Write a protein that binds this ligand. Structure first.
Ligand SMILES: Nc1nc(Cl)nc2c1ncn2[C@@H]1O[C@H](CSCCN[C@@H](Cc2c[nH]cn2)C(=O)O)[C@@H](O)[C@H]1O
Ligand SMILES: Nc1nc(Cl)nc2c1ncn2[C@@H]1O[C@H](CSCCN[C@@H](Cc2c[nH]cn2)C(=O)O)[C@@H](O)[C@H]1O
Ligand SMILES: Nc1nc(Cl)nc2c1ncn2[C@@H]1O[C@H](CSCCN[C@@H](Cc2c[nH]cn2)C(=O)O)[C@@H](O)[C@H]1O
Ligand SMILES: [Ca+2]
Ligand SMILES: [Ca+2]
Ligand SMILES: [Ca+2]
Ligand SMILES: [Ca+2]
Lengths: 242, 243, 243, 242, 242, 243, 242, 243
């Protein structure tokens, strides 16, 4: 009972903060505070166990779907504003080095992950994003924070990437709704030895993430699933079936 | 590939426009019904199915499927309402396995509940319809009073957990256009007697643009015991019993 | 004896008055329908049946039966018309033996042909309704268009000899309230294929006051192969095949 | 085809003559002439065979029922007017003598048959009729044409006849619609040795008569059926089953 | 007259064949032929109408009672021998499906009906019989012809059936003399919505069946009576009065 | 329940044994008569009646009733024969409505026809006794010659259809222990005059173990006009006249 | 890997049991047990999913073709031996009644399906089979189990059936290799309103059945496909294109 | 009709006999080769093709096609072996699109791999032959050493999944007489680079008696981009690229 009203309250605030933040930029501090609060809520064992206990399976879905939608849009808005203001253990043995090439799907307006991996690894990195504003801001952020690195950001779809066969590692942003549809597309486009990290969130985490899914055993094999109690998203590693 | 995509986009745009038009004027219903007839012919045409299956832009295809199944579910609801209003105004297969000692629940009964009425008259079974939309319940009840006043038909806006008699239900039918139908199936497990049979209406592949698809179930709970693929009908049927 | 006679006389007088009233004002229909409900309860009450069977004034009983079956046949026709008009205005078991490859003829389809519509929807068979009254054909056709426009239903005012397709008819149903139904059965012999089955609706004894009775047939032509006596329904059924 | 239009023409004339004869008595001569014409039509082998050949079984019935109705009423009207103006081989071995008692059902306003049998046989005769005018006229005719004979005419139903058990012979007028219903009633009312002559007409004769019927073999046994090509009605003899 | 001598001849043969079949099994073929002959006799419209015409009501009863007795015993003997050698439209809308439970009273040594309904419907079926030999043979036949089906055969009386309240449909063998006494007992034992099919035979059929009876309108209501000219037994359907 | 059942079983076994014994030796008659006295006291005891009515094993109760009414009917016949033989050897309420102008038929007159003799002497009526058993006729005739030689009593072994004078019979009495008495009543309808009155002896409930029960009649033929329930006598009486 | 060795083991046993059963009849019990085992294997979700997962598409084909061949021959042998020892919801609205006529292609030596439909429906039934021994045994079985029914068994090809145009329903045995070639032939031979039920098995079921095929949209339209998880064969319904 | 059937039966019987004879004596090879020449002329004769297409016994035709394509595939294999043995003993169009930078795989290389040798010498491409029959590999290798020792030709008995270099293959050719060639095509999809081109040899209609036919492919995988029907050659060619 309690969980439903918290989720409802969250959804209300999120939709308001979003509309207010799109109307005026100074609402960013409040939205960030809400997001920190939300993150703490999700990772708190009380609320996580209460969410799972709630067995109104139908009723939970509409809040989940609503929240995952509005939060994804809020995260994008935070990144855009942050950008304008400024202006591999997960992989284990399959980690990234200077001889590798990383594609990030959903690079974002403030592409910190992309810059971070490029600086530490030396690897060539490619980010794609469907939102042209995110591509524009992301590129400009790269020019300021990592101009010497080999980072390319584009609005190209995976099937338009001329160098897709040379990619060794792929990371998916969690807040991409059709991320498994893209993964399916990538099977034919990629070399045999590629490794994919799918960010996801299941259970209560699905209110701030898109969930995991079962994949066709004939294409992509899940080789690892990493559950991170202190992180807002978990990671699943996929390799092509041999 | 590109032709299927363009056709789907065109249908998507037309359905969205027709929805708005019919919401502000019920007299545009005949254009919606015609569009829906055209859509059905496209879906049931084996050439279009083959080419839809050939299209390789998985992401674009998923986005169009998701958008179309949503807008088409709402248009179907509106057609049912307008049809019910017109008959009342005067401007007008799942399972024999159901008998008169049985009790059928139909989830998503609709404003024009002809399926409900047909089961009652043909079988003599007790029939319950539920709908989440109260307008559909109200119109549905009035349709039942006009066409089948002496049959044992109850239409309510109760959730499955609220139903007093849920343990005595022998048969359940899900409307295809219910998004969360498999989540409801999961909840029904503990609510129902051991011998209940569920007919899940669905559409996969090209049929998923006018239907919600089938899903895997938990095999310790529900078992698919029968599947009817119907190449000339807009939805297929899967039967489930408890494991 | 005397009590049954008085009751029958009272019903006769009331039916004649109600007929006149409804002919000059369709808004008195609810009183006729109520009277008919009351009549049905009387007929299906086993105490009244026993006492009707006990009454020994054969001649008086025959006169009342003949008068009642006539006036009640006309009242039933009027009820069907008014019901059809009201649904259209917006002021609102025989044989499985019939399949979709079959073809049913119903003699006396009526202005509110629900039986016709039910056979079509449940079986998928081709269905023909005939009626001698053109108003019943017209209203019947319009009812069919409203409720079952996509089914293969034809309603006409043709006699059985005029029907182009009479040789392809697999099943025939007679309305109970047709006076000359057995004479029609006789004519159908040469018009129909060897395997046709006929369901004759009838009522004998007390039921003959709201129905035309069964009759002996020529045994070289038609043979009774089945008879269903239904103590809680207003008419019984006899099945005939060719000898 | 031809027969249907003759029957239609007959029905039309009959209904007119009836209405005209009820409005004014001087139309009697015309109605009598029509009835003589009708009788000749029925007994003529052409029309009799044409009637039987007509296989519109449904269509024939409505004309029959109509004609038999209107003609029965015309015969009564002729008898009434005739009365006012004035004012046993069939049985064979079971014939009527002076020691017998005859009941005629449907004695009529001009009860010639009743007077005729009474004068020839010496038998006591009783006539009944449902029409009080026919009883009144019939009695008065008897007083004029056979006052010395033992003839009683009454409006009593068979079940009200105190002397019904002493009746030896019963004759039914053909134009009584429910004559077989009366016959069924008579089984319990009559002695064991009674004989009944049922006047009837089948085929074309049914347009001027009510037809014969099958009887319950357990009560009344048909012992003879007399077909008379030159008579408007035929005769069936019934005795109680032994 | 003729009917009485046929019935007498039948009774004589039946009593002989029975005694001979109990003495030696090889007489079964002759008894079967007699039973086929008898069945054809009963369903033949000549003999059926002659039987009804015979109005020696007292005399008919002793032959009926005798025949119905001897024939019932012959049918049992046929079933026993058949067994050893080997070793729902009636209901209409109230038909049997896989979720129903059927009790047959008088299951017999060769329980074909029980196996037949179980295989077609999927319903759980229970047969009872008073004759322990019939229970023993019936069970063994089931094990051979339908081992996977849910069929239980027992010598329990209806009042000893622990699952009687879950029964949805009941069928009575016609050749049970006190079948209506059992029906009366079942009213208290059964659920509200049960449907009963009483096999019976009236008229000539009563020489191979026990007859129908009027029931207490307060308990069991006859809802249908099915007369089957080409079948040795008819069916009456009963439901509890509402 | 169980006690009544055991008592009935014990009486059944004892009656069967006593029948056999008396058939092979008429000197065991006194034991049969004593058993029958005991049986009568059991039947007429209102405590046993109440508990018999309480017993709920309808089938078992019906079987015992049927077996007892049969064996007791034969024992009663044998007692009558032995009583008649002993008087001859020298080793020894229904209707005033009967008058000397009347004529009584008693169906089942018996070997010791005291009822017959009593009606004749008290009323002066003409009396006919019939019995299906010729030994009963013979002994009955000889008893009548000894005790009432000057009365108008005829005993024959004719069926009711064979009686010359059946139309002149004013009164009829049926013995209770005749199995097919109501079927005979049905046949008598057409054989008898309009004013005949029939006294049917019967026993229902507990009394049905020593009697054949009453039955419904066809109401168009025979009408019950009077019923005498006699708590201290072994049979009750119902009077019938023609409807 | 595991599936291939099971299939190999099955094939070995099947070929042995077949050769042994053709040499001596007493091996029938073992072959039946093997067939029950095989049926359970095919319908078990583990083995069905393992079969589909095996992506040695070439290698699977030789085992399939081999198994479907040997099993078809074993089924025939079982039916022959069974025969010698002894000696419509699928259609839905298009079901079989007494006025219909059914042709079964591949009637078999023990034609239970043919007898079953004939007894329940009243329909006239025709079975054909290419194997003369199956025709001979099938006819003889019919004479014993259903002599009164209208069942004709012949070795005629579809094109030699004089009454083929009056057939309303056709059922194909699954184990007929060229069943779709026969279906193509039937288009010209049959009336317009005929309905065909093609028994088939796809996936793992193809090891005990011949598979489904795509048909010429211009002739036969698939109107229904019935997948039956608990049955060794599935059903496809075909009607002529309008 | 009957003539085509008889001819086919005669060829079937002759091929089966010749196979046996050549297996037990390689000196009967000239009779087999002559029969095969005759068969080719029959297949390529447009009159025989028309009449084969006219024959309406679909089932009989299918059985003969299936039997002939099997026995003829084995005879062709034997001819290749005997030809290879005789040359060694001393008793003796698909695609320019192939260049020296390319790499061709031929599935079903055969014991006398002249096609392989011709591609290598004319194009300068690297060539791989595979065969499932090890005798064909051995003889094929020895033929290549005799006639083309300096070309880059490798013949192996590896399946397509075993080939180290399968990703570098630019061109693939299937022998027509491989039964499961389209199933192999399906497996090659994931094994090969994006730009591979496949030449599928086939024969349909009359040509299917000496060849395996073409098939529909999954349109999301392989697309027919070109088809060459050759009325004077024993097999046709279809080219496939990835969708
Ligand atoms: N969670 C939920 N619970 C309940 Cl009780 N009802 C729900 C629900 N989600 C939605 N509904 C209700 O479903 C109604 C559907 S009416 C259209 C029927 N159309 C056929 C054929 C068809 C298939 N494709 C298109 N039409 C069908 O959907 O099977 C509609 O009135 C809507 O208010
Ligand atoms: N000769 C003839 N030929 C044809 Cl083609 N039609 C004829 C006809 N004679 C009359 N009719 C037509 O029959 C119609 C009957 S509508 C009432 C149905 N009611 C049920 C239940 C019922 C039983 N009792 C009361 N209602 C029934 O009658 O079975 C009526 O519209 C009338 O115009
Ligand atoms: N169908 C039939 N027709 C005729 Cl003419 N007679 C028939 C008959 N069936 C049987 N009988 C004869 O009836 C005689 C009965 S002597 C016992 C009288 N006892 C009293 C009091 C009584 C009641 N309960 C026990 N005793 C009574 O039964 O009323 C017996 O001799 C038997 O041969
Ligand atoms: Ca049920
Ligand atoms: Ca049919
Ligand atoms: Ca007196
Ligand atoms: Ca190149």
């Amino acid at each position: 009972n309690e969980i439903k009203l918290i989720l409802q309250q969250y959804l209300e605030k999120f939709e308001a903060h979003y509309e207010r933040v799109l109307q005026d930029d100074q609402y960013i501090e409040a939205l960030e505070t809400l997001m920190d609060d939300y993150s703490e809520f999700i990772l708190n064992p009380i609320y996580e166990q209460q969410f799972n206990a709630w067995r109104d399976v139908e009723e939970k879905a509409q809040l989940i779907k609503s929240l995952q939608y509005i939060t994804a849009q809020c995260v994008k808005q935070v990144e855009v504003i942050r950008a304008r203001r400024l202006l591999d253990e997960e992989f284990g043995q399959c980690s990234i080095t200077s001889n590798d090439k990383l594609l990030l799907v959903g690079s974002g307006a403030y592409p910190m992950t992309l810059i971070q991996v490029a600086k530490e690894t030396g690897a060539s990195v490619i980010g794609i994003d469907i939102d042209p504003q995110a591509v524009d801001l992301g590129r400009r952020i790269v020019n300021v924070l990592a101009p010497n690195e080999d980072i390319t950001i584009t609005d190209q779809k995976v099937s338009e990437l001329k160098d897709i066969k040379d990619v060794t590692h792929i990371i998916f942003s969690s807040t991409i709704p059709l991320k498994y549809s893209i993964l399916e597309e990538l099977y034919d486009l990629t070399n045999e030895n590629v490794v994919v990290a799918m960010r996801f969130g299941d259970g209560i985490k699905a209110i701030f993430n898109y969930p995991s899914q079962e994949t066709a055993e004939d294409k992509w094999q899940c080789v690892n699933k990493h559950m991170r109690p202190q992180q807002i998203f978990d990671i699943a590693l996929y390799k092509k079936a041999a």
